């Protein structure tokens, strides 16, 4: 799953097998690293725009500012809605995508940018 996107002013970040449904049982990490004094602007492109009536687990895309499982939780995104664009100067937006044992969806498309 690893697409090492280190040292880019901007670049493509996306779920595996993006135009297809993402594979099951996948717990793969992604890490965004910014040089000192920079700002991270994460652009996220949803594939499908619908309004869910519920929020659930089993497939969750959370965002962290710092090392994983050890930095404060920013938010934990799921469903088919496009999350709002996240602007922080924590300089380390490290993002993990999970997978349950079934029930794949349309995946996601994102774009990281550095200033």
């Amino acid at each position: 799953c690893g697409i090492w996107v280190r040292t880019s002013n901007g670049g493509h970040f996306a779920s595996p097998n993006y135009p297809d449904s993402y594979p099951p049982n996948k717990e793969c990490i992604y890490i965004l690293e910014a040089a000192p004094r920079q700002r991270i602007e994460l652009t996220f492109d949803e594939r499908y725009y619908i309004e869910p009536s519920f929020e659930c687990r089993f497939d969750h895309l959370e965002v962290r500012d710092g090392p994983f499982g050890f930095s404060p939780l920013i938010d934990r995104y799921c469903g088919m809605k496009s999350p709002a664009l996240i602007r922080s100067t924590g300089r380390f937006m490290w993002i993990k995508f999970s997978s349950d044992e079934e029930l794949e969806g349309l995946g996601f498309r994102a774009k990281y940018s550095f200033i």
Binding site: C56, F58, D100, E102, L103
Partner: protein, 473 residues
């Protein structure tokens, strides 16, 4: 052979062949025609009217049409929001009305000319409550589909304040196929006593789904509140040992019933069945049994009022009938042994609250009776069987199971050699030898696999969770 005609309304396909209900209705007319034991001196004819589904004004039209031709009784259509209109016409015009689908009786409707052969879900809910309390459950989990399922199980949902129960409630989504999100939820919550409430077609529709997420195992224990449960295709399930329990008002022990159902199968596969949905081909649904038993109770009423005639009442001639008052009482006092067994009517409300139920369950062979129920008595159960242990307990070879391990120096080792090998054939050690003897003495079909977390597994202070084998177990 006096002339007598019955109103037949049948919300139907508006295309294709005849529905089950109308055929079962005509079957009754023909049978009553042949065996002169009933109405030897009177021959009853019949008229049928076909309407769109769920159009009350449309039903009222045809009700007025039949009443113009004159009838004895109108066998009401099988969905409520038309049943109400037809009933309100029949009551105001004096002709008795007989219904076969349960409706939500309005809170205080002062109607007096309607009887209902479908068992009251007050009693059915009570019996389901007794069955639940017999299996000694505590965490039951109702599931329904239509909004009215609440009203239908109100006698159950009030129970938590009396007995010791905790019960969630969920709803099947509007779409039938995607039950997966509900099933996923239910499996996560560890719900192992599920009460479904849906017409048996929908039940078969969700049983496949339950199979795909592997709930169909020895853990889960569904109770199906519907009545036509035998129509299910039991075969892909009867060897996985789940504990399904339904009911069957359809008495099928009498040889007479066996013969009648059989000839029904002869004249019913006459119309094409469904090969994919998961239902038996050619089995008589309860909603047709109730049609059939309706005609018999009507005839048992009619045969004792020979003076009865067929006047041509008009909807605009609001003056009631000269035979309604006595005829209706005669009907309400009937008794009969139809395809559903005993037939009676609560004298107060003209509903039906007394009957005889055969509880059923899934044994290994198939659906087979394991007791009886009726409102008067309690729940009598005859599953007092005893089984001395076969030496190869639990299996010759059935119910394949995965096993989970971890590498330990004397116990479990991956087989050491050059050529890579797969399956439960790449491991060696002590515990494997232990498992090996288990299969040779109990007939196991085991797949071996390792723990990804790779721990013994222990209690997690942060959240109460576990890891390793304990978590996955």
């Amino acid at each position: 052979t006096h002339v007598l005609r019955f109103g037949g309304i049948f919300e139907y396909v508006e295309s294709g062949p005849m529905g089950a209900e109308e055929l079962a209705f005509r079957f009754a007319v023909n049978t009553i025609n042949r065996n002169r034991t009933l109405l030897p001196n009177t021959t009853l004819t019949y008229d049928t009217q076909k309407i769109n589904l769920y159009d009350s004004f449309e039903a009222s039209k045809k009700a007025c049409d039949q009443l113009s031709l004159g009838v004895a009784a109108i066998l009401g259509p099988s969905h409520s929001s038309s049943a109400n209109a037809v009933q309100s016409i029949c009551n105001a015009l004096g002709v008795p009305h007989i219904q076969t689908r349960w409706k939500h009786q309005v809170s205080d409707n002062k109607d007096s000319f309607y009887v209902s052969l479908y068992p009251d879900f007050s009693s059915l809910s009570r019996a389901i409550l007794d069955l639940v309390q017999f299996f000694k459950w505590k965490t039951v989990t109702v599931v329904y589909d239509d909004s009215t399922g609440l009203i239908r199980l109100q006698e159950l949902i009030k129970a938590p304040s009396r007995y010791n129960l905790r019960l969630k409630i969920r709803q099947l989504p509007a779409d039938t196929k995607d039950a997966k999100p509900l099933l996923k939820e239910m499996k996560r919550g560890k719900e192992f006593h599920v009460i479904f409430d849906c017409s048996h077609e929908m039940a078969a529709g969700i049983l496949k789904q339950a199979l795909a997420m592997g709930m169909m195992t020895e853990y889960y224990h569904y109770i199906f509140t519907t009545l036509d449960l035998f129509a299910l295709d039991v075969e892909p399930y009867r060897y996985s040992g789940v504990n399904m329990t339904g009911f069957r008002i359809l008495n099928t022990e009498n040889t007479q019933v066996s013969s009648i159902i059989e000839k029904w199968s002869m004249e019913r596969l006459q119309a094409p069945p469904k090969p994919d949905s998961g239902l038996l081909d050619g089995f008589m649904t309860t909603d047709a049994a109730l049609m059939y038993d309706a005609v018999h109770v009507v005839s048992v009423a009619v045969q004792q009022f020979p003076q009865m005639t067929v006047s041509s009442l008009q909807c605009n001639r609001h003056k009631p009938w000269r035979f309604g008052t006595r005829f209706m009482s005669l009907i309400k006092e009937a008794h009969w042994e139809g395809l559903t067994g005993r037939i009676t009517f609560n004298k107060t409300n003209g509903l039906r609250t007394d009957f005889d139920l055969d509880v059923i369950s899934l044994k290994e062979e198939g659906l087979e009776k394991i007791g009886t129920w009726d409102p008067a008595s309690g729940l009598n159960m005859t599953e007092s069987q005893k089984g001395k242990p076969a030496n190869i307990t639990d299996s010759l070879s059935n119910r394949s199971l995965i096993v989970t391990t971890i590498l330990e120096e004397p116990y479990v080792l991956f087989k050491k050699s050059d050529k890579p090998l797969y399956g439960n054939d790449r491991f060696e050690g002590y515990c494997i030898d232990l498992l090996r003897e288990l299969s040779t003495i109990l007939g196991f079909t085991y797949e071996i696999r390792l723990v990804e977390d790779g721990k013994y597994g222990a209690q997690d202070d942060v959240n109460g969770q576990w890891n390793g084998m304990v978590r996955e177990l």
